[PDB]
Symmetry: C2
Amino acid sequence: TVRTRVTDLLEIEHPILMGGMAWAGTPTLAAAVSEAGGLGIIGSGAMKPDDLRKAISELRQKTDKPFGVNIILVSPWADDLVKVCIEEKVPVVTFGAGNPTKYIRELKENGTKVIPVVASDSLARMVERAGADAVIAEGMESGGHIGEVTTFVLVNKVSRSVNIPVIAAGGIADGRGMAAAFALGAEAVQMGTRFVASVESDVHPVYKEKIVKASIRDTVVTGHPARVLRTPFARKIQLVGSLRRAVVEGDLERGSFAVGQSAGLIDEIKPVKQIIEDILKEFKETVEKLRGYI
Amino acid sequence: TVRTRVTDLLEIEHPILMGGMAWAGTPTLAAAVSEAGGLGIIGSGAMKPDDLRKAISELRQKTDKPFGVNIILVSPWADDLVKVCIEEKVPVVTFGAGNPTKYIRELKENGTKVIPVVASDSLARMVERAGADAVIAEGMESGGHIGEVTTFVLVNKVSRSVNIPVIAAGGIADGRGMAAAFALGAEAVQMGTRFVASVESDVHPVYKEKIVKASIRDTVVTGHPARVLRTPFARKIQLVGSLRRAVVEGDLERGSFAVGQSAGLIDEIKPVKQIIEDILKEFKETVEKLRGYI
Ligand code: NA
Ligand code: NA
């Protein structure tokens, strides 16, 4: 095991977060990641406050360990979903789709750790100023809605610009990537596609099979750009409910398969426990390898 | 100094290559990088055989150390430029814009090290089979014509797929990036924009100033996609001679400023010697930092 400012901040064992996408970020997958020592994350993007309350309850029936809730800022229920996180003492809240400054203070005053997802250097500095505990720097190789900067560049610039810990997201699916992210300045990694491709993930079996089969070149950017698998529906687009149809129904015809380029690094569906074991082992072997040079 | 399979293969001191873009890859910049212990590279993309012959001669008037020539496969003079490299005993030849399999054997039979630039896992395996000595895995954050895969993903997958050394290109401008690339599996790095932004680079002063001022978000992908600075001409395009107008004339109006996202990591024009010194120092500090975790 490796210790970082992020495992200290979040009071977890491993510096590894799952994605917490809508529909795929279920309490079942989040509970598995958290119990395994990482940070499971409930994706509330498609949730109403009642749905999130239930989701939090069923996660806590499985694990006592820390967990996060991801809130999409453009959701009509965003204010109320933040209020749910405060009332249910959610330990960690991540944000997507913009600047969550308006919520940071009330979350922090009530003891929640706040970690906005950013695709820019300027936004990172802004949310640091507004009180963020850490930031996720998400490169555009990730799946779903994306920014413009790649992980290799973004993590480097963001970590140099802030003093709070940086978490790298996008393109990370193994221990090599964890070491590479740490070299760029990150102190944890978020691996959305890798944990969607797990035994404990409840995405449709077809979703898992497509990730396994997909190469590093099998995603496309369509549209507010978003990265999805090169599926028939992604061709026809070049949208409402399309992500749910892929995740829940495995619909190859009109599902949007929001997966990142790291799908080309994923060749089999693994248990969450094995994923975390293999990451840590390869991270350590990679660092020993680098040490050989100096 | 750090030793890798690439410094052994190329018989150079440091595992650091410059870009060798057309117009910017001049003998003056290449000679400076090679004499400083890296691999300077003459960019022949806009050259006729006579031009390349002269270019090689003037580089050798400055340095006795190894150097490369980059050949663009779609150039009408590609066959003849390869023949020039054979006759003038060019130690290293890189290729861009496709599959250079048809030339590998004659170059290798005459003692030249052949390093194709690839943007895919499949092409990398193909050129390995055809006899390549190493491959440059170039992520789409680089400037100029680009593939689809980012460095973070591409270097990882490519290095796992071949046994020959992999050189990482795209997004690398400092020692952190060198360590990150090595973690993903690379054994050298190519830093086009970083060496264009050098005292010994002969690109127009405006070109250098734009790189310095540019942030990580100040490039755009236009068109055969190509990454350029967010300039008025890049807006109007959304082309013939446009790269020369930027590099040679510093034309903000109709120059194509082919620079990568790593321009946002570059805040000043440095001597080539200092660039290489700072890379090596930060690479070693980064590896020591990673060692702290294990
Ligand atoms: Na795959
Ligand atoms: Na800059």
